Design an enzyme around this catalytic site. Structure first.
Site, PDB file in Angstrom:
ATOM      1  CD  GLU A  13       3.037   0.052  10.458  1.00 48.94           C
ATOM      2  OE1 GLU A  13       1.887   1.042  10.363  1.00 48.94           O
ATOM      3  OE2 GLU A  13       3.070  -0.308  11.840  1.00 48.94           O
ATOM      4  CB  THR A  18       8.713  -8.901   6.846  1.00 50.17           C
ATOM      5  OG1 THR A  18       8.125  -7.902   7.794  1.00 50.17           O
ATOM      6  CG2 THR A  18       8.516 -10.103   7.452  1.00 50.17           C
ATOM      7  NE  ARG A 148       7.140  -0.314  11.034  1.00 47.87           N
ATOM      8  CZ  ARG A 148       7.382  -0.339   9.986  1.00 47.87           C
ATOM      9  NH1 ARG A 148       7.949  -1.232   9.388  1.00 47.87           N
ATOM     10  NH2 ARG A 148       6.920   0.715   8.984  1.00 47.87           N
ATOM     11  CG  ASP A 170      13.409  -2.120   1.662  1.00 47.12           C
ATOM     12  OD1 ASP A 170      14.525  -2.072   1.297  1.00 47.12           O
ATOM     13  OD2 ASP A 170      13.280  -1.617   2.842  1.00 47.12           O
ATOM     14  CD  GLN A 174       6.985   5.591   3.722  1.00 39.06           C
ATOM     15  OE1 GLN A 174       5.911   5.231   3.056  1.00 39.06           O
ATOM     16  NE2 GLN A 174       7.787   4.638   4.258  1.00 39.06           N
TER      17      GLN A 174
HETATM   18  N1  LIG Z   1       1.520 -11.611  11.400  1.00 39.75           N
HETATM   19  C1  LIG Z   1       2.187 -10.946  10.419  1.00 39.75           C
HETATM   20  N2  LIG Z   1       3.055  -9.917  10.679  1.00 39.75           N
HETATM   21  C2  LIG Z   1       3.755  -9.635   9.646  1.00 39.75           C
HETATM   22  C3  LIG Z   1       3.591 -10.018   8.279  1.00 39.75           C
HETATM   23  N3  LIG Z   1       4.435  -9.385   7.412  1.00 39.75           N
HETATM   24  C4  LIG Z   1       5.064  -8.455   8.113  1.00 39.75           C
HETATM   25  N4  LIG Z   1       4.622  -8.481   9.414  1.00 39.75           N
HETATM   26  C5  LIG Z   1       5.118  -7.640  10.920  1.00 39.75           C
HETATM   27  O1  LIG Z   1       4.478  -6.269  10.324  1.00 39.75           O
HETATM   28  C6  LIG Z   1       5.280  -5.308  10.599  1.00 39.75           C
HETATM   29  C7  LIG Z   1       5.529  -4.421   9.563  1.00 39.75           C
HETATM   30  O2  LIG Z   1       6.185  -4.955   8.276  1.00 39.75           O
HETATM   31  P1  LIG Z   1       7.513  -4.312   7.826  1.00 39.75           P
HETATM   32  O3  LIG Z   1       7.938  -5.420   7.047  1.00 39.75           O
HETATM   33  O4  LIG Z   1       8.243  -3.733   8.799  1.00 39.75           O
HETATM   34  O5  LIG Z   1       6.671  -3.265   6.837  1.00 39.75           O
HETATM   35  P2  LIG Z   1       7.198  -2.198   5.904  1.00 39.75           P
HETATM   36  O6  LIG Z   1       6.929  -0.865   6.468  1.00 39.75           O
HETATM   37  O7  LIG Z   1       6.526  -2.460   4.817  1.00 39.75           O
HETATM   38  O8  LIG Z   1       8.857  -2.560   5.591  1.00 39.75           O
HETATM   39  C8  LIG Z   1       6.437  -5.855  11.296  1.00 39.75           C
HETATM   40  O9  LIG Z   1       6.569  -6.139  12.806  1.00 39.75           O
HETATM   41  C9  LIG Z   1       6.407  -7.458  10.745  1.00 39.75           C
HETATM   42  O10 LIG Z   1       7.190  -8.229  11.310  1.00 39.75           O
HETATM   43  C10 LIG Z   1       2.668 -11.192   8.259  1.00 39.75           C
HETATM   44  O11 LIG Z   1       2.377 -11.734   7.029  1.00 39.75           O
HETATM   45  N5  LIG Z   1       1.981 -11.617   9.363  1.00 39.75           N
HETATM   46 MG   LIG Z   2      10.608  -1.607   6.185  1.00 38.00          MG
END
Ligand SMILES: Nc1nc2c(ncn2[C@@H]2O[C@H](COP(=O)(O)OP(=O)(O)O)[C@@H](O)[C@H]2O)c(=O)[nH]1
Ligand SMILES: [Mg+2]
Length: 314
Positions: A13, A18, A148, A170, A174
């Site tokens: 997360e 993103t 997501r 990416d 985990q």
């Molecule tokens: N408000 C906001 N939401 C974000 C930001 N970066 C990511 N998100 C949201 O946070 C959630 C987790 O991000 P994700 O990229 O899926 O995380 P991952 O598990 O590292 O790939 C998603 O629903 C994104 O749209 C940010 O800078 N601001």
């Molecule tokens: Mg991801």
């Protein structure tokens, strides 16, 4: 042209997927109509899981509905969630969700999201539900950016920029990401480590004794100082600066760092977090690590930040 293998690392997360979607929007050609139609089921599932989490938290946190009539709505909602085809959003369900979203008790609970780890896009989708369920609805790129999905496969993002051929991956730490570790750490040109600034007041789902920012700090320490990356370019993205700017107004940073004695402003608390990560680099006086405050959902911000990363690489 020269090939650049770039890894996006960070806790779950944090914003890895993103940034990957932003690369498609910025360096590839965004999403076609059919690709946007793909995201409808994902967005509905995301939306339903967000409201269910807030509803369950009413119980867990013991918050009562502003209107007792909502209790029946909650019950019907839970029931429907078990009945509907996954990824759908029937009129009856969306009608119930909108009534719940408007309830003051539900809103008091929403404001206490940190306490139950609600995903960050909950408010985004829920406050705009009517647009999402209008017959004819096609997800916008921001809608797609906010989604997501659980991707088990290895996704390589390839694109050319400033005469460099990027091969981006990416990778999480985990256990379910293990297949990626077989080769992802070989010949890396650059590592972009992503840490959510807003993770400071959150604990793990399982270990309520473990703070998420501390887990991210722990992973950064492990990667940053690993012999494999002694001469690898490493850049730090302190993500979710938008969520952080709001959070900082309500939760003091000392919740995460007992030693923090600052005024808890976006700038000073932000710099303090940056320092906590950067101080871990034991190669620091020899190998410098740049960092940027980022909002991964903001295309212009990501475009600027990635451009700086590219100049560093060059
Ligand atoms: N408000 C906001 N939401 C974000 C930001 N970066 C990511 N998100 C949201 O946070 C959630 C987790 O991000 P994700 O990229 O899926 O995380 P991952 O598990 O590292 O790939 C998603 O629903 C994104 O749209 C940010 O800078 N601001
Ligand atoms: Mg991801």
């Amino acid at each position: 042209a020269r090939t650049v293998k770039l890894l996006l690392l960070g806790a779950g997360e944090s914003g890895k997927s993103t940034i990957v979607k932003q690369m498609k929007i910025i360096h590839q050609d965004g999403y076609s109509l059919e690709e946007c139609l793909e995201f409808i089921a994902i967005i509905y599932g995301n939306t339903l899981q967000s409201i269910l989490a807030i509803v369950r938290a009413m119980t867990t946190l013991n918050i009562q509905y502003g209107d007792s009539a909502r209790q029946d709505d909650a019950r019907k909602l839970m029931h429907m969630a078990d009945t509907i085809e996954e990824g759908t959003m029937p009129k009856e369900m969306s009608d119930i969700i909108q009534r719940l979203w408007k309830d003051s008790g539900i809103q008091a609970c929403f404001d206490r999201a940190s306490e139950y780890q609600l995903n960050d896009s909950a408010g985004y989708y829920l406050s705009d539900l009517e647009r999402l369920v209008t017959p004819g609805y096609v997800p916008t790129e921001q809608d797609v950016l906010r989604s997501r999905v659980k991707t088990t496969g290895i996704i390589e993002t390839q694109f050319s920029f400033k005469d460099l051929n990027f091969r981006m991956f990416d990778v999480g730490g985990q256990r379910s990401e293990r297949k990626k570790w077989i080769h992802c750490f070989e010949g890396v040109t650059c590592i972009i480590f992503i840490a959510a600034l807003s993770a400071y007041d959150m604990v793990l789902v399982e270990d309520d004794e473990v703070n998420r920012m501390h887990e991210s700090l722990h992973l950064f320490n492990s990667i940053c100082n690993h012999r494999y990356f002694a001469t690898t370019s490493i850049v730090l993205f302190l993500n979710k600066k938008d969520v952080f700017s709001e959070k900082i107004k309500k939760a003091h940073l000392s919740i995460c760092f007992p030693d923090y004695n600052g005024p808890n402003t976006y700038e000073d608390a932000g710099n303090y977090i940056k320092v906590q990560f950067l101080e871990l680099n034991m190669r620091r006086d020899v190998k410098e690590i740049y960092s940027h405050m980022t909002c991964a959902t903001d295309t212009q911000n990501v475009k600027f930040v990635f451009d700086a990363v590219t100049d560093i690489i060059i």
